[PDB]
Amino acid sequence: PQITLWKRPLVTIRICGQLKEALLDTGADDTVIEEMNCPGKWKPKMIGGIGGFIKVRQYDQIIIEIAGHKAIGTVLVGPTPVNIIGRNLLTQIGATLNF
Amino acid sequence: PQITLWKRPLVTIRICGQLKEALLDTGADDTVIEEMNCPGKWKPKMIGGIGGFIKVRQYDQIIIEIAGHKAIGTVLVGPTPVNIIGRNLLTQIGATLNF
């Protein structure tokens, strides 16, 4: 598709057998999703943004669908105000910026 | 241009006389730049993001040149980790996410 930027570029994602809404975020190096329970090996991590840093759990080789596109990568889980799809996953669904 | 996201989508901008480097950020509603002086009246506001909120100064109808493209609108100057170009200007230059 072509997402235009008048409204937040929100998209449906299936992670861990659960459908959710996430933001297509070219500004994020990484992907961050609200507190799940999907078990797995994970390493602790702190990611920074505007107002400071939050603690997250880093899972590796996680499967996701992003608006119907299958992807596989590092997802970070933690108290994020909105589910964010960063560049690690945007590259995998072939997303580009154009103007 | 078409901009892939293997690297951070950074661009040169021209704001309030200074040349600077900024991130084309489709997750940001607003455009926030590291602290610098711009002339004119500004009003204090507060913006959120991961990590929480920060106090910023709002400048209206500011000319910004983004990667050779002209925009004129709101710029929030404050303590951001990185200069970011949000949807309020990305729409001005005709920016769209494509995949």
Q: With H, G, I as helix, E, B as strand and everything else as coil, classify residue A88.
A: helix
Name the method of structure determination: X-ray
Q: Tokens 């997402």 identify what position?
A: A3
Structural domains counted in chain B: 1
Residue B55, judged by CB atoms within 10 A of its CB (0-12, 13-18, 19+), counts as: exposed
Resolution in A: 2.8
Could you list the residue range(s) of the whole structural domain that residue A21 is in? 1-99
Distance CA A68, CA A86 (A): 17
Report the b/e string of A41-56 with b at 16+ CB within 10 A: ebeebebebbbeebeb
Here the tokens at position B95 are: 């920016």
Is there a contact between A95 and B98 if contact means CB atoms under 8 Å apart?
A: yes
A15 interface with B at CB cutoff 8 Å: no
Instruction: Write the CB contacts of B45 (distance below 8 Å, at least 6 apart in sequence).
Output: B55, B56, B57, B58, B76
Query: How far lies A11's CA from each of A44, A85, B52, in Å?
Result: 27, 9, 23
Residue with tokens 């494509």: B98
Put simply, the answer to whether B52 touches A47 (Cβ < 8 Å) is no
Q: How many residues does the structure list for chain A?
A: 99
CB of A8 less than 8 A from some CB of B: yes
Read off the CATH number of the domain in which B41 is found: 2.40.70.10
Half-sphere exposure of A4 (CA within 13 A, CB side): 4
Coil, helix or strand at residue A76: strand
CB-based contacts of B7, cutoff 8 Å, min separation 6: none
Query: CA triplet B2, B80, B87: central angle to 5 degrees?
Result: 40
Cα–Cα distances (Å) from A8 to A17, A57, A72, A90, B91, in that order, read: 24, 26, 24, 16, 11
- Contact flag A99-B99 (C-beta cutoff 8 Å): no
Q: Read out DSSP for B37-70?
A: ---S-EEEEEEEETTEEEEEEEEEEEEEEETTEE
Give backbone dihedrals phi and psi of B87, rounded to 5 degrees, phi first. Answer: -60, -25
Look at residue B88 and give its three-state secondary structure: helix
A 10 A CB-CB count for B77 gives 22
> Per-residue b/e over B36-48, b at no fewer than 16 CB within 10 Å?
eeeeeebeeeebe
Q: Which residues of chain B make contact with A51, given a CB cutoff of 8 A?
A: 48-54
Cβ within 8 Å of residue A50, ≥6 positions away: B32, B47, B48, B49, B50, B51, B52, B53, B54, B80, B81
